[PDB]
Design a protein around this ligand. Structure first.
Ligand SMILES: CCCCCCCCCCCCCCCCCC(=O)OC[C@H](COP(=O)([O-])OCC(O)COP(=O)([O-])OC[C@@H](COC(=O)CCCCCCCCCCCCCCCCC)OC(=O)CCCCCCCCCCCCCCCCC)OC(=O)CCCCCCCCCCCCCCCCC
Ligand SMILES: CCCCCCCCCCCCCCCCCC(=O)OC[C@H](COP(=O)([O-])OCC(O)COP(=O)([O-])OC[C@@H](COC(=O)CCCCCCCCCCCCCCCCC)OC(=O)CCCCCCCCCCCCCCCCC)OC(=O)CCCCCCCCCCCCCCCCC
Ligand SMILES: CCCCCCCCCCCCCCCCC[C@@H](O)O[C@H](CO[C@H](O)CCCCCCCCCCCCCCC)COP(=O)(O)OCC[N+](C)(C)C
Ligand SMILES: CCCCCCCCCCCCCCCCC[C@@H](O)O[C@H](CO[C@H](O)CCCCCCCCCCCCCCC)COP(=O)(O)OCC[N+](C)(C)C
Ligand SMILES: CCCCCCCC/C=C\CCCCCCCC(=O)OC[C@H](COP(=O)(O)OCCN)OC(=O)CCCCCCC/C=C\CCCCCCCC
Ligand SMILES: CCCCCCCC/C=C\CCCCCCCC(=O)O[C@H](COC(=O)CCCCCCC/C=C/CCCCCCCC)COP(=O)(O)OCCN
Ligand SMILES: Nc1ncnc2c1ncn2[C@@H]1O[C@H](COP(=O)(O)OP(=O)(O)O)[C@@H](O)[C@H]1O
Lengths: 107, 98, 347, 140, 320, 459, 57, 48
């Protein structure tokens, strides 16, 4: 069996490289310290300072396009009107029956 | 539709079936093709002559000519195939398989 | 051969196709088919070897039988009506024999057996020409008499072609046989919409022609005819493998690629005529074509196969002969889905 | 041709069990003979006698499958007193699948055949009820 | 106007260039024989073009700049290692043999292209023919396995079935003790380790196989050490003889056109030197292949096409 | 809507023109800016919708998904920054291009005023995901995984296309607005039954349903970290969005047809939660947890009540964020240990305390601790199902108990106990990873302050 | 035993993916296994021509 | 530590004449690398 016991010419599997040996204060972003530091800074500034704070403030103070206060005030004025005249609050029929034309069965 | 046309079409069908059986001898395949051509010529000639389609009398000759040229081409191919094996056996052409 | 002779033969093939396309007489259509067949054989036998000669003689046998059947159908149609013009077929099974002859010319199932054989035997350029240009004339004739077909027979043959292409492509290692089975499946897709809309047939033919041209010219650029031979291309031309994988994804019918446009349209057209089961079956069968395309893509670009030491020398050389239309073909076969409504141009 | 289809379809589903079984057996024999012809044309096994034996085996298998499917489908439809119900066709199909499996002598294949045939028969009955067209005529 | 079908159609026919002095000649000899001197003298006297024997970095001398590249980027083998440890574990021997055969194929293609394009003849050292003898010897000495010679035979058949053999084969015959003495006098420390059995095997493979096989399609001039000293007699023998037995007489314009299109476009010449047959000596893994290809790309004038490399100094890129 | 789409398209030339060492910085900064721009879509109305044009419209169902899709890209880049360090610049640019194409396809999918355009983009999302899985995966099974992830999807989606065009031949339109305003009841017919199945199964395969969930563990385990995040966070929600959009035309046939799928989901959540208990793989455990949560979302959509829809929307958003965070944590462990087995690396709280805190928070939010939005969606779905039938509460309680069990099991196995002695290559956690977990977790606890932003159009 | 191995790893895998792979592989082997003899192909073509002449009319 | 890439054993699966070899197709051989197969003057005696 003169086979070399090697299936092919393969590079040996490299060992994992640690970013902390060649650069303490490594931030885990890049091997180049300057690119590393600036990547950390841009990530922190645009993620935490810009989006997370300003976007949260923007969402918090969104104008009432869902018309919650409008609906509340409409309901208050309507119930004030109906309590005054004694109408029985909300009617059971959403649409008035006189404008509906039922089909006569005659069965 | 008369009986002579049926007989000619039966001859064409028999020649086609013989071409499609393929016992051996690709030369036999060429012979079957030429038999089908002869049947086509005969029946087209009968149809054209019977109805007095004067101009269509060009059509048979043309057909013949063209088909005969085909035969030549086929013959040439056969020779080259034989030039590889020495015989025109059908089963010799098994190098290509689906 | 002599370049003048090759040019003359190519022009004769094109002239035969054009004579089939522009003529209104059945005899002239037969003559054009005969001229195309006559000029096609030496193109298939440019590179002289026993395999090429065998493929050429098989192709000649099939095409001559188809031509004789076509002439027989013409003669019966003349017998039952003294008409030579290409119109409604005017008769029963004379039309059946015309459909069978055109199916044998196109390679539709069950007359598909010659396509893988001839494609494997001949070279890549001959395969390109055979699988691209040799479909125009029979498809044009079918489109002209599309109001005459029996829809049952045409639809049966189209479904059989799709099934056979899908199943046969799964077992192939040679690239040319894969191309042949892909052609069979695409022809099956093309002919299943002929009874309903010939415009969709022509659109599918254009898309398939563009995709097949891009595929074959990529295969010619990276001169490999086998899966393992193609697996070595990444170590010399990675960009070719990437474009090849994108083209393969397009050929599988994946949106938003171009190959999705025909099937989509066809399916839509087929639902306009209350046909629901058959488009569904067609899509489920095209999944097989997609599978073997994906296997080829796996072997080609998505994984890096072992190479050889001699390949290093090939790193020092550049392709002397370049195909000008390859980038345009790739772009057209990949990125023209947004331009779909332009099919109103009656392409 | 369509003669066998007409013969099978003309008979009412809940009556004439024997006639339905005969029509189904005829259709099965026809398709088995066609499959045997295709197999012989594509693959000549060893000789004339082996070929005719294979033809007989395939034809009798297909005829048996058709017979079993028809009797079960018709008997179930008659006893259940609910004609035009795909469930009877399913059961008939399931029975047919089981007999194929018994012929080939495999529980898996028999089990597989029963499930698939039951589905195909139910789909065919549903298409007959709803008018589904496998080969749609050109409309627009 | 780069040569192609258009040039052939218009004017370009290579039969009119042949003036009975093309006569491609290959000079063959054993190791440390004076075949190179005889080839150079033949080329000088007959007015032909001499091709020095192809080495490891022959291909580097024809592409980009003529300077050789790194050993790991070009060849991945060395003759010094083969001389030192002919039975090395990493399969360097057959890797060397395959790379050398491919280099010889490229050199033969270049020589044929020059002959067909200019009409001037060429003189070559050991060609793709007779390259097998080393392989043969390497098999009998136990340096390489039978799978290596089988792969070599496959590649040699598929490649060499496309070319015209040389018009004249010149052989210099020297006894083994004499070139052992010449090897000792040479002064190369790695060459001192060549055994007598290896040289005897090379010489046996030459006479037993090469000369009888070339005799039926070429014209052979067997010479010894003494009468190979004078090149005048060799040139007189070359001029007196006329070749009418090989494949050259039956060639014509179209065959020459096909051969010229084949010898150009070296990528197709070397197409079958990398067939997907996996021998552990020559196959290279994906990771090493990727790393080495990336290193080759990072070479100064190799990232783009020859005329599109800014770092080398190519200008007007954006308008080419 | 183009104010979001055009910058996403411009992300590609910027990525390809960037310097060899500035691709990550540019991509991250501009993706964060695009997310900030997309935040403007959250201003919805109680009226119909935000109909920008004939092609794209927004909704309070579409807006949270769009915001999550935009926000996921910077996190994907930050997590992919680690294991792509030894990669050539061209291939890193190609990876970023795949991510950008995926984001663009998702953005155009979620607006999609028309159903055929929705289908086209819904399938267009397949290609970049398949390439990412099968090209930048580590093991040899990735190829197989890709095949599964492809064909399953197509097996469900090709029938849908047919159904879609069929509808356009009868109704005359596929626009969502016209479909809603002109909806007509579906007669209980076999043809209508199969139309229902064709419309439904394409989206049920992507959730995935319990019977059709086999592709998900393979695809999640084999894909790289960015692929796992995009699969678990957004791609699973495409099916829920599709069902929510398409169930309008299926009534009243949904009442009868929903029973098999309701049974499958209600039993499959229990089955997959139990499967999570016996798992030797972290990624497989997280994938099966995703399957359970999406089974609950399927139940919610099938019940078809307003509370069901609100709870389903909230649960999709919450599960996306939580599953992405869990996958990131497991990836941080794997990049140190290179094994991806739970039992091997133990006692990590002693070595990495802050990472243990991140693990605890992620497990707590996966366990549906109130008042997290996970719990809000869970509780809304449970209440709607209880109104549907009072016996569902047994299955939901079982699911909650098993969920808590396996979540705390995963936390305790990896963080608590005694450290493995021979494992000595565990370096301190980088700033990048801690920032990644913080950016995953802070939006959840901010959204619990304003739940109505993720409660859908039925709020 | 049941949820993980019996159902998820075996039977749910057996039904949809494995059965499809087996059926497609068997059909591919059946269809693609042709010995390249034009005799068999021509006999099949004749059988098909006869069947279509006897069935589609 | 490194991404898995196909080895010789994986690649040898795709080197056969067809996919899925069977007992009937086991004897099939891949076609030659170049599509050329090996190819594998009379005398007359005029007497008196
Ligand atoms: C839409 C439907 C389109 C369907 C598909 C279209 C078919 C395309 C193939 C046609 C020609 C074949 C070809 O060029 O090779 C394939 C070609 C690849 O070229 P190649 O592989 O590098 O060349 C190898 C040749 O086989 C090597 O052959 P060669 O170099 O020896 O040939 C010499 C050359 C040079 O010809 C000459 O020397 C001219 C001399 C004039 C002689 C006068 C004769 C008069 C009688 O002539 C040609 O190349 C053929 C041109 C014939 C003229 C057509 C009119 O691919 C294409 O051309 C695809 C084009 C895309 C479709 C056409 C344009 C879009 C519409
Ligand atoms: C309770 C009220 C507090 C209000 C004051 C404001 C607090 C703001 C905190 C916001 C959330 C923190 C961000 C999460 C990441 C952790 C930060 C970090 O890296 O720590 C490093 C930092 C420095 O430590 P180190 O020595 O450098 O590192 C040593 C190792 O890390 C070793 O680490 P360790 O062992 O020291 O663990 C750290 C600690 C903390 O780390 C965590 O695990 C934080 C996760 C807490 C909840 C987990 C998810 C469950 C879903 C609840 C969502 C509600 C959010 C409400 C709105 C939030 C606004 C953003 O872990 C725990 O103690 C477990 C907490 C489990 C609490 C379960 C009770 C849930 C319901 C509580 C009431 C909420 C609504 C009440 C409504 C009715 C009354 C008004 O540690 C801290 O700062 C600890 C944070 C203070 C404890 C917070 C626990 C409850 C707060 C819940 C959210 C705020 C409630 C809003 C108003 C309620 C009235
Ligand atoms: C480290 C230890 C602690 C130190 C810090 C001590 C201080 C603690 C205080 C922090 C939390 C304690 C609770 C105090 C709550 C006060 C703030 C709260 O009241 O405001 C909320 C406001 O918060 C926002 O509504 C929620 C935040 C927005 C969430 C969006 C996420 C940010 C986008 C980033 C990408 C998103 C990714 C996920 C995709 C969806 C509720 O507002 P609302 O009652 O209504 O009305 C506001 C006033 N109006 C009437 C004028 C409108
Ligand atoms: C693999 C993991 C899960 C995958 C997805 C599974 C979910 C899909 C299951 C589909 C749901 C059921 C399909 C049809 C439901 C209709 C209701 C029917 O089952 O009930 C009776 C129907 O009776 C019988 O069921 C008839 C059908 C019997 C044949 C069907 C096969 C049964 C088992 C097959 C299951 C295999 C599924 C997977 C296929 C690959 C009611 O009797 P009837 O009043 O008359 O019919 C009412 C409907 N009408 C009005 C339109 C006529
Ligand atoms: C009408 C016909 C419908 C056809 C439907 C096609 C479904 C798409 C999948 C097609 C795959 C068929 C090929 C196949 O599986 O072969 C077995 C193949 C052999 O491997 P090779 O790499 O080819 O070679 C190994 C030897 N070196 O095994 C595999 O690897 C399969 C792995 C991926 C399986 C994909 C999962 C597909 C099933 C999911 C559901 C889709 C089914 C479609 C119909 C569903 C019913 C409604
Ligand atoms: C994850 C993999 C699962 C695969 C998805 C399977 C479920 C999808 C259903 C199967 C395909 C059906 C597509 C139907 C397309 C919609 C069109 C439609 O519904 O119109 C019907 C068409 O209905 C049909 O034709 C249905 C025929 C089905 C043929 C193919 C059957 C495929 C296998 C079905 C068995 C499996 C059933 C359950 C599958 C669940 C998933 C496992 C009406 O037809 P017309 O003739 O035009 O109406 C006039 C007369 N009233
Ligand atoms: N096919 C081959 N295999 C291995 N080594 C070879 C081969 N061909 C040539 N060489 C080496 O090339 C060297 C030069 O050859 P040689 O003719 O002996 O010297 P010189 O060039 O001075 O005449 C020698 O050391 C020889 O071993």
């Amino acid at each position: 069996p003169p086979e070399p016991t090697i299936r092919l010419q393969e590079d040996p599997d490299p060992e994992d490289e640690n970013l902390y040996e060649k650069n303490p204060d490594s931030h885990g972003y890049d091997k180049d310290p300057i690119v590393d530091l600036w990547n950390m800074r841009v990530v922190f500034f645009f993620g935490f300072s810009i989006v997370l704070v300003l976007g949260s403030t923007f969402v918090a103070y969104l104008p009432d396009y869902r018309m919650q206060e409008w609906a509340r005030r409409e309901a208050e004025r309507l119930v004030k009107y109906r309590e005054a005249n004694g109408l029985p609050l909300m009617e059971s029929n959403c649409f008035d029956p006189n404008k509906i034309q039922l089909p006569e069965d005659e069965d | 539709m008369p009986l002579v046309y049926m007989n000619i079409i039966m001859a064409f069908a028999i020649a086609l079936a013989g071409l499609l059986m393929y016992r051996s001898h690709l030369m036999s395949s060429l012979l079957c093709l030429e038999g089908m051509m002869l049947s086509l010529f005969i029946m087209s000639t009968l149809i054209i002559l019977n109805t007095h389609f004067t101009l269509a009398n060009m059509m048979p000759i043309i057909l013949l000519v063209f088909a005969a040229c085909e035969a030549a081409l086929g013959l040439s191919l056969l020779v080259m195939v034989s030039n590889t094996y020495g015989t025109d056996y059908v089963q010799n052409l098994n190098l290509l398989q689906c | 051969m002599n370049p003048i002779i090759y040019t003359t033969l190519i022009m004769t093939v094109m002239s035969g196709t054009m004579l089939v396309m522009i003529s209104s007489h059945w005899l002239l259509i037969w003559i054009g088919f005969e001229m195309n067949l006559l000029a096609m054989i030496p193109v298939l036998m440019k590179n002289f070897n026993p395999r090429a000669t065998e493929a050429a003689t098989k192709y000649f046998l099939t095409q001559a039988t188809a031509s004789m059947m076509l002439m027989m159908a013409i003669i019966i149609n003349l017998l039952y009506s003294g008409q030579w013009t290409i119109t409604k077929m005017f008769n029963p099974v004379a039309m059946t024999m015309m459909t069978m002859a055109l199916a044998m010319k196109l390679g539709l199932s069950p007359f598909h057996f010659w396509v893988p054989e001839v494609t494997q035997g001949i070279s890549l350029q001959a395969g390109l020409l055979l699988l691209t240009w040799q479909k125009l004339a029979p498809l044009s004739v079918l489109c002209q008499i599309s109001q005459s077909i029996n829809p049952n027979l045409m639809l049966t043959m189209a479904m059989l072609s799709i099934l056979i292409g899908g199943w046969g492509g799964l077992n192939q290692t040679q690239l040319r046989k894969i191309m042949a089975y892909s052609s069979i499946a695409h022809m099956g897709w093309m002919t299943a919409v002929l009874p309903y809309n010939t415009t969709m047939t022509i659109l599918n033919l254009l898309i398939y022609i563009t995709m097949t041209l891009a595929m074959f010219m990529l295969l010619i650029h990276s001169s490999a005819t086998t899966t393992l031979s193609l697996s070595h291309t990444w170590n010399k031309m990675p960009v070719i493998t990437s474009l090849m994988m994108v083209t393969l994804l397009s050929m599988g019918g994946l949106p938003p690629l171009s190959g999705f446009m025909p099937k989509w349209m066809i399916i839509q057209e087929m639902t306009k005529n209350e046909s629901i089961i058959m488009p569904t079956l067609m899509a489920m069968t095209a999944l097989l074509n997609l599978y073997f395309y994906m296997r080829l893509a796996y072997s080609s670009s998505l994984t890096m196969f072992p190479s050889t030491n001699n390949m290093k020398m090939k790193w020092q050389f550049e392709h002397t002969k370049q195909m000008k239309l390859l980038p345009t073909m790739i772009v057209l076969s990949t990125l023209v889905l947004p331009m779909t409504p332009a099919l109103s141009s009656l392409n | 041709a369509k003669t066998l289809l007409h013969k099978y379809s003309d008979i009412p589903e809940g009556t004439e069990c024997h006639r339905k079984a005969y029509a189904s057996t005829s259709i099965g024999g026809a398709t088995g003979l066609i499959v045997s012809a295709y197999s012989i044309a594509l693959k000549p096994p060893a000789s004339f006698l082996e070929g005719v034996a294979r033809t007989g085996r395939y034809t009798f298998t297909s005829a048996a499958i058709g017979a079993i499917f028809g009797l079960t489908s018709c008997i179930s439809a008659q006893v259940r007193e609910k004609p035009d119900d795909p469930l009877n066709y399913f059961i008939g199909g399931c029975a047919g699948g089981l007999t194929l499996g018994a012929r080939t002598r495999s529980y898996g294949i028999g089990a597989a055949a029963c499930a698939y045939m039951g589905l195909t028969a139910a789909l065919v009955k549903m298409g007959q009820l709803e008018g589904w067209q496998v080969f749609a005529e050109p409309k627009v | 106007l780069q040569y192609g079908p258009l040039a052939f159609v218009l004017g370009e026919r290579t039969t009119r260039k042949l003036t009975e002095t093309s006569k491609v000649i290959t000079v063959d000899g054993n190791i440390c024989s004076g075949k190179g001197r005889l080839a150079r003298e033949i080329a000088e006297k007959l007015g032909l073009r001499h091709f020095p024997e192809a080495g490891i970095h022959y291909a580097d001398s024809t592409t980009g700049d003529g300077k050789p590249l790194d050993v790991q980027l070009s060849g991945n083998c060395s003759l010094e290692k083969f001389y030192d440890d002919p039975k090395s574990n990493d399969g360097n021997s057959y890797r060397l043999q395959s790379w050398l055969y491919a280099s010889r194929l490229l050199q033969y293609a270049d020589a044929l292209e020059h002959l067909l394009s200019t009409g001037q003849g060429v003189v070559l050292e050991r060609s793709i023919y007779s390259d097998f003898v080393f392989l043969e010897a390497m098999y009998r000495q136990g340096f390489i396995r039978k799978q290596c010679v089988e792969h070599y035979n496959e590649v040699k058949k598929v490649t060499a079935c496309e070319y015209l053999p040389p018009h004249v084969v010149v052989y210099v015959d020297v006894p083994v003790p004499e070139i052992q003495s010449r090897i000792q006098k040479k002064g190369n420390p790695h060459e001192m380790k060549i055994t007598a059995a290896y040289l005897q095997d090379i010489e046996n493979a030459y006479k037993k196989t090469f000369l009888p096989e070339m005799s039926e399609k070429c014209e052979v001039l067997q010479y010894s050490a003494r009468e190979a000293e004078d090149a005048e007699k060799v040139v007189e023998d070359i001029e007196y003889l006329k070749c009418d037995k090989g494949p050259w007489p039956d060639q014509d314009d179209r065959t020459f056109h096909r051969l010229r299109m084949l010898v150009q476009n070296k990528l197709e010449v070397l197409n079958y030197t990398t067939i997907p047959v996996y021998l552990p000596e020559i196959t290279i893994g994906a990771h090493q292949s990727d790393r080495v290809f990336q290193k080759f790309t990072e070479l100064p004038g190799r990232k783009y096409s020859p005329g599109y490399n800014e770092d080398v100094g190519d200008k007007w890129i954006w308008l080419k | 809507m183009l104010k979001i789409i055009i910058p996403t398209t411009m992300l590609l030339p910027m990525t390809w023109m960037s310097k060899h060492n500035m691709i990550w910085i540019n991509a991250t900064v501009h993706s964060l800016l695009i997310s900030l721009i997309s935040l403007s879509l959250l201003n919805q109305l109680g009226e119909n919708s935000l109909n920008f044009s004939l092609t794209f419209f927004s909704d309070s169902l579409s807006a949270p998904l769009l915001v999550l899709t935009t926000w996921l890209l910077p996190l994907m880049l930050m997590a992919s920054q680690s294991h792509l360090s030894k990669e050539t610049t061209t291939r890193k640019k190609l990876y970023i291009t795949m991510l950008i194409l995926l984001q663009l396809f998702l953005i155009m999918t979620f607006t999609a005023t028309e159903l055929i355009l929705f289908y086209i983009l819904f399938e267009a999302t397949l290609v970049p995901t398949l390439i990412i899985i099968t090209r930048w995966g580590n093991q040899t099974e990735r190829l197989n995984a890709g095949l599964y992830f492809l064909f399953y999807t197509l097996a469900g989606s090709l029938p849908l296309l047919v159904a879609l065009v069929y509808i356009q031949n009868t109704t005359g339109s596929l626009n969502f607005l016209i479909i809603h305003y002109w909806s007509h009841p579906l007669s209980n017919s076999w043809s209508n039954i199969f139309m229902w199945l064709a419309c439904i199964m394409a989206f049920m395969v992507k959730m995935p349903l319990y019977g059709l969930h086999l592709w998900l563990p393979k695809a999640h385990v084999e894909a790289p970290i960015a692929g796992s995040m995009v699969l678990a966070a957004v791609l699973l929600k495409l099916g829920g969005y599709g069902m929510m959009r398409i169930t309008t035309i299926l009534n009243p046939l949904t009442n009868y047809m929903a029973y098999p799928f309701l049974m499958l989901s209600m039993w499959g959540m229990i089955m997959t939660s139990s499967i999570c208990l016996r798992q030797t793989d972290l990624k497989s455990l997280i994938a099966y947890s995703s399957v359970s949560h999406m089974a609950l979302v399927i139940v919610a959509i099938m019940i078809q009540t307003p509370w069901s829809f609100m709870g389903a929307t909230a649960l999709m958003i919450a599960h996306g964020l939580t599953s992405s965070m869990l996958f990131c944590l497991a990836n941080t462990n794997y990049e140190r240990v290179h094994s991806r087995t739970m039992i091997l690396a133990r006692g990590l709280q002693t070595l990495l305390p802050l990472m243990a805190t991140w693990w605890l928070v992620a497990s707590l939010t996966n366990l549906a601790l109130p008042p997290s939005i996970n719990l809000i969606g869970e509780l809304f779905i449970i209440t709607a199902s209880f109104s549907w039938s009072n016996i569902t509460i047994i299955l939901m309680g079982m699911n909650m108990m098993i969920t808590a069990l396996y979540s705390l099991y995963m936390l305790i196995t990896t963080q608590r106990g005694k450290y493995t002695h021979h494992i000595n290559n565990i370096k301190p956690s980088f700033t990048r990873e801690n920032a990644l977990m913080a950016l995953h977790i802070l939006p959840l606890l901010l959204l619990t302050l304003n739940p109505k932003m993720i409660l859908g159009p039925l709020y | 035993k049941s949820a993980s191995s019996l159902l998820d790893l075996i039977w749910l895998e057996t039904i949809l993916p494995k059965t499809t792979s087996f059926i497609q592989m068997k059909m591919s082997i059946m269809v693609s296994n042709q010995k390249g003899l034009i005799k068999l192909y021509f006999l099949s073509f004749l059988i098909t021509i006869m069947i279509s002449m006897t069935l589609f009319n | 530590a490194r991404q898995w890439q196909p080895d010789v054993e994986w690649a040898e699966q795709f080197g056969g004449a067809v996919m899925y070899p069977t007992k009937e197709t086991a004897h099939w051989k891949p076609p030659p690398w170049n599509d050329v197969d090996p190819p594998k003057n009379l005398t007359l005696n005029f007497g008196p």
